[PDB]
Amino acid sequence: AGVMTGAKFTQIQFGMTRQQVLDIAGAENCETGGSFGDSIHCRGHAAGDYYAYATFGFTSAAADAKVDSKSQEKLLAPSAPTLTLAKFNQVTVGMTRAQVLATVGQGSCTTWSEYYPAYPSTAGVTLSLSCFDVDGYSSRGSAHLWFTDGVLQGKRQWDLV
């Protein structure tokens, strides 16, 4: 059924069952148990010293649990990366998602991590954005912006110019 991809990632929805996730991703790309506990971890093509991947968290270890968490690295590309050390330094704790996007560029960010501790309720939702500059989405120069309930809690960057 191919390797894990962004299209598969996107098609997979919160609230789904393990079976649906596997249906879409292709059980052959995916693992569970071991280091990933009850989560389902699916691999795409090689990247970094690992592989492009998605990880899906579930409301419980039970068989009918639902997706309450979606994570990915190198499965989604930024639409128009414009991040700079300048804008990054403009981002401040307390900003809403919208405020942050305006600052870093509405094309610069992808969703690293998205988790609903109270699924299906969105209360307490936590969000990690991975944001990239000019060339940052290649294989260098990016940031991590994390939110709770849509309010920025913190930020970190690596080799922004």
Partner: protein, 261 residues
């Protein structure tokens, strides 16, 4: 040596190899004393240093480590998942070895006293070439002629031997290190690709991704035969040069041929 020279020229860079047959004492050596960037391959020795310290500090491996989003770095598939619950030192070690988990590696370095702490451990087991200077992700720069965060294929292999087959670690810790290496998920297309699928292999990979810089080291157990220890490192002159898993597998095959394996 000629076949190695040809391989590296096809590749467009430099290749360093050192392999030893622990049954005969025979070795194969190509640029084995030149420095190559460690990249993620330092995480293997990081785990060993954690295990060594656990011999001195009881309960170390079972210590729950709590961290927040501030500790995450790109390429951290395991630590990202356990953010809400934390992870034990043993779990962090397994993640660093088996998935090249970056956040886990920095958390462990912290326990050891940083890069100088790891370097000091490597000195303690007789390795005088190994040097780690920086943390993730800065240690991946791989700038030609930069000696920071490098070692040589020979020193890597000699240390690997001491840790996995020798007495650098106590027996229980030695077996844990071996088990972690055997469970590595990142190296199916490198040294593992050069050997029969039913031979036990423990390996740690590294991929800086700039300057065609990548690597793998391994202990290989040929059925019925004594183990082989080997390290293959690659390097290239230009930043945009690509690394090649195929070249590493090919170099491994050559080294194994050289040992009569």
């Amino acid at each position: 040596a000629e076949p190695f020279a040809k391989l590296e020229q096809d590749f467009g860079g430099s290749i360093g190899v050192y392999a030893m047959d622990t049954g005969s004492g025979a070795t194969v050596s190509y640029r084995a004393e030149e420095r190559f960037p460690l990249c993620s391959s330092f995480k293997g020795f990081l785990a060993a240093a954690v295990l060594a310290r656990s011999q001195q500090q009881a309960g170390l491996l079972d210590t729950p480590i709590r961290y927040g989003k501030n500790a995450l770095v790109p390429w951290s598939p395991i630590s990202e998942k356990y953010l809400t619950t934390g992870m034990t030192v043993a779990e962090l070690s397994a993640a660093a070895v088996q998935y090249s988990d970056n956040a886990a590696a920095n958390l462990l370095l912290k326990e050891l006293g940083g890069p100088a702490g790891l370097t000091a451990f490597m000195r303690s087991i007789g390795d005088t070439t190994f040097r780690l200077d920086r943390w993730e992700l800065e240690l991946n720069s791989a700038i030609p002629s930069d000696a920071r965060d490098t070692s040589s294929p020979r020193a890597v292999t000699e240390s690997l031997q001491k840790l996995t087959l020798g007495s650098a670690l106590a027996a229980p810790q030695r077996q844990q290190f071996v088990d972690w290496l055997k469970g590595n998920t990142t190296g199916n297309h490198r040294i593992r690709a050069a050997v029969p699928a039913d031979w036990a292999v423990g390996d740690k990979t590294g991929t800086c991704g700039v300057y065609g810089t990548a690597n793998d080291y391994a202990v290989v157990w040929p059925t019925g035969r004594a183990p082989i220890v080997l390290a293959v490192y690659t390097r290239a002159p230009n930043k945009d040069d690509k690394h090649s898993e195929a070249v590493i597998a090919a170099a491994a095959r050559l080294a194994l041929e050289g040992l009569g394996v």
